[PDB]
Design a protein around this ligand. Structure first.
Ligand SMILES: [Zn+2]
Ligand SMILES: [Zn+2]
Ligand SMILES: [Zn+2]
Ligand SMILES: [Zn+2]
Lengths: 115, 120, 117, 103
């Protein structure tokens, strides 16, 4: 599969993390109930790259929201529904290019993350 | 493909706009170009299920339904048009390169009456 | 058509394209003031809205026309301080190597009816 | 295979920048990434350090047709996460450009 958004690149030691309510990329064409998913760390070492996938999609579709697993953090905006977002799924690189991952301003990023 | 991202339908209500609303915002287009159709594309998850439909906007005379004139009744096709726009084919805008170029986020003027389950 | 560095100016109205002297050269920040001179060539493909493509002086389909030469479908533009020399170091665009640059005109450029930027 | 438009060379004075200046503006990039090189073909294409046709070249390598630029605070690391894809080559207001270069 492939993430619908671009990657947040890690530069320092601090892994990616977000306070509750923040972290979900901006996607004005999706419902408020969809604003829930996870970031997955992919290390090639190199600069770690965290790719966002909606709940129930991506390499960790079977995991419930909040399932503790290394390289997987969870985010959910106030008002989302704990349901698999099958109607979004993942992106196909041959069909769609990645969306520039943007976050609402006032979002707290760790040292070494920029958006 | 469409120049704009799809309006996904999260409810039972199909997409519809009052006259004068519904045309996406595109700064690289003239007022004579603010007219076109939305086309519904429905898919199935086949999870042991009809997924939420997505509506793609295409300009008049472009896209899959490039031959349909304005106002043409057809299932899965609705028509939007800003006042002052011209009822002519618009090949100078045409369609988009999906995986080659980029998709434009479908925006609408503040105050556009969106049905339930549509967001922008 | 397409062989130009810039996107087209589409004529949505009846009036042909024209500019007052000193206007009409597309914004190209990485180019000398001596380069700000060239012409627009109308391309027509029921008829569709005509599309006007910009080519620098001494380039494009009319690379042999001197500046100011009268020819239907060719209007001339030039910014204050441009040299009347062929811009051979700029040339045309190869769509296989470079994409077109969105045509932008300075704020306050006088445009005829049916021309937008 | 660059990201920014090339700085066209008008004349024969090759492209060069003082220390701290020369890196094109990229709002989609971190301050640690503001380092790279320009490759000549004439046009000068910018490539972030470790990407493009001269990826394996270390910063400061003295090869013909390659100049090095870097912003204050940048890290001498390969910027592979940026890679190679246009974007108008935009420099901060006040960048000392040689004769025959315009931005
Ligand atoms: Zn949705
Ligand atoms: Zn138009
Ligand atoms: Zn020049
Ligand atoms: Zn970076």
């Amino acid at each position: 599969t492939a993430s619908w958004f671009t990657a947040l690149t890690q530069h320092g030691k601090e892994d990616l993390k977000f306070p509750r309510g923040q972290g979900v990329p901006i996607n004005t064409n999706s419902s408020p109930d969809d604003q829930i998913g996870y970031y997955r760390r992919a290390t090639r070492d190199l600069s770690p790259r965290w790719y966002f996938y909606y709940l129930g999609t991506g390499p960790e579709a079977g995991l419930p929201y909040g399932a503790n697993k290394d390289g997987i953090i969870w985010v959910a905006t106030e008002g989302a529904l704990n349901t698999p977002k099958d109607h979004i799924g993942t992106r196909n690189p041959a069909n769609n290019a990645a969306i520039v991952l943007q976050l609402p301003q006032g979002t707290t990023l760790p040292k070494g993350f920029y958006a």
